[PDB]
Design a protein around this ligand. Structure first.
Ligand SMILES: CCc1c(C(=O)NCc2c(O)ccc3cccc(O)c23)[nH]c(C)c1C(C)=O
Length: 116
């Protein structure tokens, strides 16, 4: 497979993460890991087996933990899928998740094309 350097991936992908951080208030529940004790949802880790959030993804981009860009896409999707799984379909966080996913779908496609 074709190699991707960490600096190359950060430069290309960080603007798509920025697009999510720019969604205010919609990104706010996603900017830090879910804390089930604080949020009063003790069953969270029983339902969501692989937690993910924007701060974790940003750290991985910053430190160079992605070898290829689809690994980043996978983490973004994991974050969305967790929220759609756990939260009720009429809930604020479910709706915020849907908004972030719409933004991501629009931003990510030209970026992935350029990476090749
Ligand atoms: C519903 C708890 C939850 C949060 C969260 O952090 N809620 C608290 C929150 C904020 O941390 C910041 C702004 C909020 C603005 C509105 C409603 C909220 O609740 C907000 N984030 C995720 C991914 C979940 C679940 C379970 O999937």
């Amino acid at each position: 497979s074709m190699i991707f350097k960490p600096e190359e991936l950060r430069q290309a992908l960080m603007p798509t993460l920025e697009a999510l951080y720019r969604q205010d208030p919609e990104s706010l529940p996603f900017r830090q890991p879910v804390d089930p004790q604080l949020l009063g949802i003790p069953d969270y880790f029983d339902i969501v087996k692989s937690p993910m959030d924007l701060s974790t993804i940003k750290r991985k981009l910053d430190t160079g933990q992605y070898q290829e860009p689809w690994q980043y896409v996978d983490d973004i999707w994991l974050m969305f899928n967790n929220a759609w799984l756990y939260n009720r379909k009429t809930s604020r966080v479910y709706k915020y998740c849907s908004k972030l996913s719409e933004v991501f779908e629009q931003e990510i496609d030209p970026v992935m094309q350029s990476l090749g």
